[PDB]
């Protein structure tokens, strides 16, 4: 499963 | 940033014969950036349907695609991947040799 | 044995031709088993392997969200990274992420992945603890105090651990019959006239599985003078190729031989001409 980014760069 | 030129192989799934159908592979790895245009040609006219995987990239970042193509190999009938990069100031063509 | 699951996502900005091009593609070991591709006119994260396609719709609905979830991110931080890097505007950039879970025999995590990169070089990287970042420079090291703030580390580090591995492990149930097969290669050698004096020898390893492997010559029993060996290569069917070619003297041709290590071989071929 993919899991998405949690914080901006 | 820093381009990098696709390295190219040309060959066939199975060891290729004579008469017997078969699968073209242009394999291009290594390149960035990630736009890239591949055609396959036989006897210098472009292969009308062509699949490309998905694109994805390498531990290293670099990015690499399998296009391929079917096709039976005669005595006469010359195949090849033809490359267009923007780190090559021409496109490269790379002929299908059966010994690879 | 050990396994592996991956993604590798990519966004490519296209300035003044729309929004950037965003793909995600998913492998477990050296199989691509999933991909979500932005270009589509409703696109959706998708099977690319037989074996996933009975998986039900809340799997491809969860999954297509999160993946939208990132391509907004992708967008964000693709305009971030160009300021950060004081980047003339306009030109295509890149940002790309690899991440996922290793297990050895031992279903317990054994690597964990979370880097990132723009314009195709190092930007930030998960380091090995699973607790600490790696910067690839002054302008990633902003990012850095901002993922240290939120703590991102140890919530990556839950995905890492629990549903990461969690997932591997049904994948390799999914698709056990292929993803668990071993092909040993093929090996053999041609003779190639290459003038009065020389030959090539090729050494080849064909339709193999998983595609790791060692294919080389030597000269004597010792190792081994120029040597071309070609990037292994997919031969689409599942399978991999490599070939391993080396010129040598004519009349010499019987000293020279070539070595084959696989996960499939009992024993390492040697090939002699």
């Known amino acids: 499963k993919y899991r998405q980014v949690a914080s901006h760069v | ?100 | 044995g050990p396994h592996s699951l991956r993604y590798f996502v990519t966004a490519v900005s296209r300035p003044g031709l729309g929004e950037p091009r965003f793909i995600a593609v998913g492998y477990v070991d050296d199989t691509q088993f999933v991909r979500f591709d932005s270009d589509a006119d409703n696109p959706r994260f998708e099977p690319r392997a037989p074996w996933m396609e009975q998986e039900g719709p809340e799997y491809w609905e969860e999954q297509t969200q999160r993946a939208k979830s990132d391509e907004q991110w992708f967008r964000v931080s693709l305009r971030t990274a160009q300021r950060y890097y004081n980047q003339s505007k306009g030109g295509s950039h890149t940002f790309q992420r690899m991440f996922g879970c290793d297990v050895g025999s031992d279903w317990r995590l054994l690597r964990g992945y979370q880097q990132f990169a723009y314009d195709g070089r190092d930007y930030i990287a998960l380091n090995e603890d699973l607790k600490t970042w790696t910067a690839a420079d002054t302008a990633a090291l902003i990012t850095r105090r901002k993922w240290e703030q939120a703590g991102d580390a140890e919530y990556y580090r839950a995905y890492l651990e629990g549903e990461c591995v969690e997932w591997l492990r049904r994948y390799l149930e999914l698709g056990n019959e292929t993803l668990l097969r071993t092909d040993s290669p093929k090996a053999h050698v041609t003779y190639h006239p290459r003038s009065q004096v020389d030959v090539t020898l090729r050494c080849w390893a064909l339709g193999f599985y998983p595609a790791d492997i060692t294919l080389t010559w030597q000269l004597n029993g010792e190792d081994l003078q120029d040597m071309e060996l070609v990037e292994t290569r997919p031969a689409g069917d599942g399978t991999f190729q490599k070939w391993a070619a080396v010129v040598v003297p004519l009349g010499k041709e019987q000293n020279y031989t070539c070595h084959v290590h696989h996960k499939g071989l009992p024993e390492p071929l040697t090939l002699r001409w």
């Open chain 2, 1 to 100: 940033m820093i381009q990098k030129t696709p390295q190219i192989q040309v060959y066939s799934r199975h060891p290729p014969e004579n008469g017997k159908p078969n699968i073209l592979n242009c394999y291009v790895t290594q390149f960035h950036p990630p736009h890239i245009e591949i055609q396959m040609l036989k006897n210098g006219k472009k292969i009308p349907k062509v699949e490309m995987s998905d694109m994805s990239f390498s531990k290293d970042w670099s990015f690499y695609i399998l296009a391929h193509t079917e096709f039976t190999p005669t005595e006469t009938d010359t195949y090849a991947c033809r490359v267009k990069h923007d780190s090559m100031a021409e496109p490269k063509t790379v002929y299908w040799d059966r010994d690879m």
